[PDB]
Amino acid sequence: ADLGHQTLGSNDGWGAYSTGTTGGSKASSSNVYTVSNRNQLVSALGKETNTTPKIIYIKGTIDMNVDDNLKPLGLNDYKDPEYDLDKYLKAYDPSTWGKKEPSGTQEEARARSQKNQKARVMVDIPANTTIVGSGTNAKVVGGNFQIKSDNVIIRNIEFQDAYDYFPQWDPTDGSSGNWNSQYDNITINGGTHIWIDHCTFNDGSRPDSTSPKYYGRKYQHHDGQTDASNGANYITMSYNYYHDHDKSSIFGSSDSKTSDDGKLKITLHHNRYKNIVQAAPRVRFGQVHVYNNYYEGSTSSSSYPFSYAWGIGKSSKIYAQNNVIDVPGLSAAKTISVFSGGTALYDSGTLLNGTQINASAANGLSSSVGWTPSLHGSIDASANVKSNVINQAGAGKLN
Ligand SMILES: [Ca+2]
Ligand SMILES: [Ca+2]
Ligand SMILES: [Ca+2]
């Protein structure tokens, strides 16, 4: 079968569980679309009622920050009439506003501005859908795909720069506050049976090194790359290339969302993370199989310095095998970050800078995560992971 008609293999990760992930492979001809702009993409996707098997080939670059005539939209197009960055900055400056939550005119105007952009960039993917890049240059720029449905395949697309023109200041986010933005490349919001494969995720032409600092904190226009939340379940992410980005993959959005327990069953394999700061993945609750991934970066990088690879969040059950981490000077312990409620991690075959390490033991974590993955393909020796992943991961490697 061609790219549009291929399904996730019956052994290939958590996405293969129960009914598996077949996307729109059973599509009739009348439900096979080629799209090359926002209008064509939105028309092909339709509404949540569009559950018939469908295949959508993306041809070329689809810029999601465009109006209905495909004219590019920017800050002043989306801006609420009452919003002004200078005044927003003046209103909420810690030196005069303190650490209370931004409220009043400018914050309300910013929130409205954000909803204006959201209307353009954020799109829901309906059930039984395969979206695949045609050739080696299929791109989604500025877009935030959301999957709340069942049975979706996304492959061979370079997702670039899910950019929020209106980051929100939160003075209570960390010891010196932070700016936060809303858009991921892909958000799995309660979605199930999903395969994300041979995609690339990056910050395009607007990396975080091009954003100024306000209040001494980076004016952060980006959110996640591939996030999973709200009971998202049975997902395989394979052969993806994540690069040049801060927060990559957050699985389970809140310590309070205890309904995520028993869900967030995700398999990550053969992914490349280059110059990714953190959360690759950060996990709460989920049985997450992480195998044969390659991580490369620098703690002293000026654009995207490595912080950690695996986030051991509340009640997380990461099962890691034969992953390779290349970050000069990094200790075995610092390959991961342990958050309150995180007590367990299984990792075997972990290679840090060419040396075999035990990340779990280095962090005093239990190795008992209470499960072992039964749905997986062949496991590469750690020794071949770097080569295999660099050669095979990302968009434009199939076509
Ligand atoms: Ca935050
Ligand atoms: Ca976020
Ligand atoms: Ca997110």
From Swiss-Prot:
Q: Which InterPro entries does UniProt cross-reference here?
A: Pec_lyase, Pectin_lyas_fold, Pectin_lyase_fold/virulence, PEL
Gene Ontology CC terms: extracellular region
Query: Could you tell me where the Basic and acidic residues compositional bias lies?
Result: 98-111
One matching Pfam family, short form? Answer: Pectate_lyase_4
pH-dependence annotation? Optimum pH is 8.4.
The record's subcellular location field reads:
Secreted
> What is the UniProt remark on how the cofactor binds and its stoichiometry?
Binds 1 Ca(2+) ion per subunit.
Where along the chain is the active site annotated? Answer: A279
GO MF terms on file? metal ion binding; pectate lyase activity
Q: What is its EC number?
A: 4.2.2.2
Give the region (Disordered) as residue ranges.
96-118
Cofactors: Ca(2+)
Q: Between which residues do disulfide bridges form?
A: none
Activity as a function of temperature is given as: Optimum temperature is 42 degrees Celsius.
GO terms for biological process, alphabetical: pectin catabolic process
Reported induction: Negatively regulated by TnrA under nitrogen-limited conditions.
Pathway given for this chain reads: Glycan metabolism; pectin degradation; 2-dehydro-3-deoxy-D-gluconate from pectin: step 2/5
Q: Which Gene3D superfamilies match?
A: Single-stranded right-handed beta-helix, Pectin lyase-like (2.160.20.10)
Keywords for the protein's UniProt record, in alphabetical order: Calcium, Lyase, Metal-binding, Secreted, Signal
Domain of life of the source: Bacteria
Which reactions fall under this protein's catalytic activity? Answer: Eliminative cleavage of (1->4)-alpha-D-galacturonan to give oligosaccharides with 4-deoxy-alpha-D-galact-4-enuronosyl groups at their non-reducing ends
What is this protein for, i.e. what is its function? Answer: Produces unsaturated products from polygalacturonate.
- Family, similarity comment: Belongs to the polysaccharide lyase 1 family.
Subunit architecture: Monomer.
- Name recorded for this polypeptide: Pectate lyase
The organism of origin for this protein: Bacillus subtilis (strain 168)
